[PDB]
Symmetry: C2
Subunit: 201 residues, 2 copies
């Protein structure tokens, strides 16, 4: 099983998830600029969009999209309990959470990670990020978990993105509940293990 990643990118979530489950896999780093793997291979052959994360199974089939990859990882080792049992109703809540993160929150940042983005555009994106953080901060105030009451891949996914604002000049001190929320997660050994492996710890 190969998980294609890029240091600190959205692919960190799947990375942390695989380390939480202990499943075997090799992390293959990708140079998103040249769109080539560390080994030097052409990543476009793996995922035509050139984006990470990408998960290639032992069968040879590759899976893309964080929500799909995260749920897949969790389901291969249910003992880890990173996702509600298949068929359960809390599963849709999780899906909804993963989908909000990938389609709304994650996208609010994109303009801030773009080279030729107008000042007003950046100002607009920064404004959207903050509005999301404020809503997320209010939602998690007094709560430890984003989807339900157990630790899940949605928490891992959100944790990762919560490390992006400070990256784009936004001070998290304005969101106490998020800082507390993220702080707990940052301590799990799998988080530090994934980070160290990417060379960011």
């Amino acid at each position: 099983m190969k998980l294609f990643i890029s240091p600190g990118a959205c692919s960190l979530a799947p990375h942390i998830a695989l380390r939480e489950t202990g499943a075997d896999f090799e992390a293959v780093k990708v140079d998103l600029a040249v769109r080539k793997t560390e080994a030097g291979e052409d990543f476009l052959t793996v995922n035509p969009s050139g984006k990470v994360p990408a998960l290639t199974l032992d069968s040879g089939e590759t899976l893309t999209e964080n929500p799909a990859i995260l749920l897949y990882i969790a389901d291969q080792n249910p003992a880890s309990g990173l996702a509600p049992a298949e068929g359960s109703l809390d599963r849709y809540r999780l899906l909804s959470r993963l989908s909000f993160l990938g389609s709304e929150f994650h996208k609010a940042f994109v303009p801030l990670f773009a080279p030729a983005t107008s000042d007003e555009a950046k100002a607009a994106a920064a404004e959207s990020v903050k509005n999301h953080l404020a809503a997320l901060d209010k939602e998690l105030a007094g709560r430890d978990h984003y989807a339900g009451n157990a630790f899940s891949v949605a928490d891992i996914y959100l944790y990762v993105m919560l490390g992006w604002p400070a990256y784009v000049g936004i001070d998290m001190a304005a969101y106490p509940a998020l800082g507390a929320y993220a702080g707990k997660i940052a301590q799990r050994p799998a988080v530090g293990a994934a980070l160290k492996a990417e060379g960011l710890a």
Copy 2:
């Protein structure tokens, strides 16, 4: 079961899905301009973000985000087969498609539907929508269905989005495979029934 929608919006997907499964439900139209449902309620109470679609389940909860809602709708009637069964690898393939459609394709349109958007921003959005359309066309020229081997909620989700390009200045005659693809789905009884119900204004 209640589905909150707005004529022709992204909420048309779940609407068609509920008709495909033959479920008993009610579609509550929402005036997005003032966040009020045709039932009088302040829609922000049903869904704090003020966005459709939103699905209040027969078990009491309100679900948001198309991928989650669409998957839930399909699962309620396994005899309809609108999504692969839990436990199958094919389910993740579906989740990946729903995720791409919701996080990449759908989002590429936003700037084109926004009022204050500048000409440059619109031009950039158009180019992004066109780039996805070209990839999707090439992709669907080789298969019958978008996700897997049979008609699924991913096809309904994509079909709805394929109904937007032309109205914002992107000639769909440029994508023959997509045109043929949408033309078949457009004929389904559930699709036309949803259009007939939404077209009344």
